[PDB]
């Protein structure tokens, strides 16, 4: 049904060079996997006005593109045409296993970044897996080997609140009610607060930031392709982190 908001053609135009030879995940991310994953999160791309629905999709793909970008300044078609180039945290990484009786680490497994949102740590693989009905604590690699599972973990993140942080979905579809603390911190609804939700401690509230600008670059390019306005408050340069 999200297919009513973004066509296969638009999807490939957005994630243009993801299957180029230099991309680690070439061949992995497919439109069919995206659509299948979206079916498990009915509200995604189907909540709010047509414009809100388009932005919900554009913002999701933009923030996940940043997490998996293969872009660079002199890249063909610009840096914002290289989202979804990777599916696993680069380098030697780490175990990302912390003591937890609720989401215990499985022996020998590592919970480094995987998929569109670079899901990390046992305490995130745990609830994400439960949400999609897959044991990701015992088989975390599925996030990097099954594209449908991969996209589902990212949508789980997109649709899940971390109170006081609202879900990114709620913000972009205009369903978030900022608190007095949010208003005092300058956190107004828009793409900017979503960046804050994802990595504000490190990127927000300290003026112009290239990481924030990269996220915005992807978002504008994707909104342009779907033909929707960006909405207001795109950056978080003056927002206090959550
Ligand atoms: C001078 C010149 O022309 N050099 C070219 C190279 O730049 C180019 O390779 C590309 O280089 C950029 C950096 O310059 C690189 O971008 C990095 O990509 C990784 C992977 O996605 C990002 O890592 C993510 O960071 C977030 C936030 O920290 C994490 O949450 C997330 O887990 C990470 N994701 C993963 C999978 O690890 C970096 O943030 C990002 N760095 C920057 C500054 O944006 C591209 O990936 C490189 N592209 C490719 C295809 O390798 C090279 C291309 O061939 O060409 C050179 O000429
Ligand atoms: Zn295609
Ligand atoms: Zn290409
Ligand atoms: Zn850690
Ligand atoms: Zn700072």
UniProtKB/Swiss-Prot annotation:
Residues annotated as site: May be involved in substrate-binding: 72, 95
Question: What general EC class does the enzyme of this chain belong to?
Answer: hydrolase
State how changing residue 72 to A affects the protein, per the record.
Chitinase activity is reduced to 51.2% of wild-type. Decreased anti-fungal activity
What outcome is documented for mutating residue 89 to Q in this protein?
Answer: Chitinase activity is reduced to 0.33% of wild-type. Decreased anti-fungal activity
List, in alphabetical order, the GO biological process terms annotated in this UniProt record: cell wall macromolecule catabolic process; chitin catabolic process; defense response to fungus; killing of cells of another organism; polysaccharide catabolic process
- Detail the relationship between temperature and activity: Enzyme activity is retained almost fully under 40 degrees Celsius and completely destroyed at 70 degrees Celsius. At 60 degrees Celsius the activity was 15-30% compared to the untreated enzyme.
Q: What happens after mutating residue 95 to A?
A: Chitinase activity is reduced to 79% of wild-type. Decreased anti-fungal activity
pH-activity dependence text = Optimum pH is about 5.0. Stable between pH 4-8.
Show the disulfide pairing. Answer: 23-85, 97-105, 223-236
GO terms under cellular component: extracellular region
The organism's place on the tree of life at top rank: Eukaryota
InterPro entries, A to Z: Glyco_hydro_19 (IPR016283), Glyco_hydro_19_cat (IPR000726), Lysozyme-like_dom_sf (IPR023346)
What is the tissue localization of expression for this protein? Answer: Localized to the starchy endoderm of the seed May localize to other parts of the seed including the aleurone cells (at protein level).
Give the similarity note.
Belongs to the glycosyl hydrolase 19 family. Chitinase class II subfamily.
Protein's UniProt name: Basic endochitinase C
Q: Which organism is it from?
A: Secale cereale
């Amino acid at each position: 049904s999200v297919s009513s908001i973004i066509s296969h053609a638009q999807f490939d135009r957005m994630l243009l060079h993801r299957n180029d030879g230099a991309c680690q995940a070439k061949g992995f991310y497919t439109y069919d996997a995206f659509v299948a994953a979206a079916n498990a999160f009915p509200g995604f791309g189907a909540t709010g006005s047509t414009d809100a629905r388009k932005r919900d999709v554009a913002a999701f793909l933009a923030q996940t593109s940043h997490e998996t970008t293969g872009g660079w300044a002199t890249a063909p078609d610009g840096a914002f045409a290289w989202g979804y180039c990777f599916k696993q945290e680069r380098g030697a990484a780490a175990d990302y296993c912390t003591p937890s009786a609720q989401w215990p680490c499985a022996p020998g497994k590592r919970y480094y970044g995987r998929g569109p949102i670079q899901l990390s740590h046992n305490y995130n693989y745990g609830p994400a897996g439960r949400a999609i009905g897959v044991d990701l604590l015992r088989n975390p690699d599925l996030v990097a080997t099954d594209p449908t599972v991969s996209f589902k973990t990212a949508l789980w993140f997109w649709m899940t609140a971390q109170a006081p942080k609202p879900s990114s979905h709620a913000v972009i579809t205009g369903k978030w009610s900022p608190s007095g603390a949010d208003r005092a911190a300058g956190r107004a609804p828009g793409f900017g607060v979503i960046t804050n939700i994802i990595n504000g401690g490190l990127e927000c509230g300290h003026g112009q930031d290239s990481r924030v600008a990269d996220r915005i670059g992807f978002y504008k390019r994707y909104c342009d392709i779907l033909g929707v306005g960006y909405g207001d408050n795109l950056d978080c340069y003056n927002q206090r982190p959550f």
